[PDB]
Amino acid sequence: MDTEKLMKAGEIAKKVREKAIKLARPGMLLLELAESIEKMIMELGGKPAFPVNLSINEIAAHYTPYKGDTTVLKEGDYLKIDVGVHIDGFIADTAVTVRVGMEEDELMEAAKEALNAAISVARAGVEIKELGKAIENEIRKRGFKPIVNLSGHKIERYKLHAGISIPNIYRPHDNYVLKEGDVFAIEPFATIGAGQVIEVPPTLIYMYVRDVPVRVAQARFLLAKIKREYGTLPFAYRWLQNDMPEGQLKLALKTLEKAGAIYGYPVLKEIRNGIVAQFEHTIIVEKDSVIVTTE
Ligand SMILES: [Co+2]
Ligand SMILES: [Co+2]
């Protein structure tokens, strides 16, 4: 298909990912880094497929700063940086952990290694469970635990998560077989904790999921804006902050939520507050090898 796109998106992804790494310095204010990255995506001809995620230490995914966030990077922090950019709808979702002001530690290695292992065996005609088995074994062999309740996702145009998962564990029933042209995001997560993650407030990322009618005026606007500018792809609370004052927006969003026009993606924290590491690449399933659009 338009692999030229998926690839071109991966390309921006990679590139902005690298700079992201470089900007992530101790002292760096979280809100800024977010914006710098997000602004570069665009500046490269890209469009964010979703808010850049900067999850620190025990919080694993779904945390994106906001206008008002005073979080700053302390030396020693395990900053996982997840970036995603789309071109006309083709996604490149790539991620990396960075130990603020220090070198890659054994944990991060476990994750990075897991990813490789998944990648190396991904090819047409193989059950996902093999991937998950590969990932699991590398993280456990080194002493950590793979986050069980977080997984990779199949990707489709203007669809960040198609519906098929590549978990970071081996389950005998994950029998989906890789088909040529399939494009997947493989994302192992590792931790020193229980190996499980749980939803936690606040919720900073939302996704429009259904065109339903809303009674309140602000909501119908918010919604109409959301639908227009964002579409199927996840958006940040932060992005809607310069449209309407906090208290209102808050309501706007909440209302759309109760109605069911957008889904809330809460922040995820390890159940035992165990540091979490992560690495991810987008792969386009070929017949003999896969092709890492983002590395
Ligand atoms: Co990602
Ligand atoms: Co992903």
Distance CA 288, CA 280 (A): 21
Based on the domain organization, do 209 and 182 belong to the same domain?
Answer: no
Q: Within 10 Å of residue 233's Cβ, how many Cβ atoms?
A: 20
Is 153 assigned a catalytic role? Answer: yes
List C-alpha distances in Å: 124 to 91, 159, 173, 190.
Answer: 20, 21, 18, 26
Annotated binding site for a divalent metal cation: 82, 93, 153, 187, 280
Indicate whether 292 and 173 sit together in one domain: yes
Q: Are residues 133 and 228 in the same domain?
A: no
- For residue 7, the tally of other CB atoms under 10 A from its CB is 17
82 plus 162 within the same structural domain: yes
- Which residue reads 């065109």 in tokens? 211
For 26, residues 6+ apart whose C-beta sits below 8 A from its C-beta are: 73, 74, 75, 77, 100, 101
Ligand 2 mean position to 53 CA, how many Å?
A: 10
Q: Are residues 109 and 224 in the same domain?
A: no
Domain interval for residue 83: 1-194+272-295
Residues 203 and 172 in one domain: no
Considering the domain architecture, whether residues 15 and 67 belong to the same structural domain is answered as yes
Q: Do 162 and 257 share a domain, yes or no?
A: no
- Same domain as 199, residue 189: no
Residues 187 and 220 in one domain: no
Show the tokens assigned to 68: 């008002």
Give the chain's domain count. 2
Alpha carbon of 214 to ligand 2 centroid (Å): 31
Separation of first and last alpha carbons in the chain: 20
Q: Is 77 tagged catalytic? A: no
Ligand closest to 62 (CA) is 1
Give the residue numbers of the binding site for substrate. 62, 161
Q: Which of these is catalytic: 127, 161, 257, 286?
A: 161
Given a contact cutoff of 8 angstroms between Cβ atoms, the answer to whether 51 and 141 are in contact is no
Q: What method did the depositors use to determine the structure?
A: X-ray
Task: Please give the distance, rounded to the nearest whole angstrom, from the Cα atom of residue 84 to the centre of ligand 1.
Answer: 6
CB 192 within 8 A of CB 292: no
* Ligand positioned closest to the Cα atom of 94: 1
* Distance (Å) from CA 251 to ligand 1 centroid: 28
**179 touches 145 (CB < 8 A):** no
Polymer length of the chain: 295
Residues with CB under 5 A from ligand 2 (ion): 93, 185, 187
Tell me if 53 sits within 8 A of 89, measured CB to CB: no
Q: How far apart are CA 295 and CA 232, in angstroms?
A: 26
Exposure of 247 by Cβ count < 10 A (0-12 exposed, 13-18 middle, 19+ buried)? exposed
CATH number of the domain that residue 10 is part of: 3.90.230.10
Residues 54, 34 contacting (CB under 8 angstroms): yes
* Span from the CA of 93 to the centroid of ligand 1 (angstroms): 5
DSSP assignments along the chain, one per residue: --HHHHHHHHHHHHHHHHHHHHH--TT-BHHHHHHHHHHHHHHTT-EESS--EEEETTEEE-----TT---B--TT-EEEEEEEEEETTEEEEEEEEEETTS---HHHHHHHHHHHHHHHH--TT-BHHHHHHHHHHHHHHTT-EE-TT-EEEEEBTTBS--S-EEESS--TT--PBP-TT-EEEE--EEESS-S-EEEEEEEEEEEE------SSHHHHHHHHHIIIIITTS-EETGGGTTTS-HHHHHHHHHHHHHHTSEEEEEEEEETT---EEE-BEEEEE-SSSEEETT-
83 C-alpha to ligand 1 centroid (Å): 6
Q: Give me 133's structure tokens.
A: 């088995």
Q: How far apart are CA 189 and CA 268, in angstroms?
A: 12
The active-site residue out of 77, 113, 174, 187 is 187
Do 220 and 168 have their domain in common? no
Cis peptide preceding 202, ω within 30 of 0: yes
Spot the catalytic one: 38, 93, 130, 182: 93
Q: Are residues 92 and 232 in the same domain?
A: no
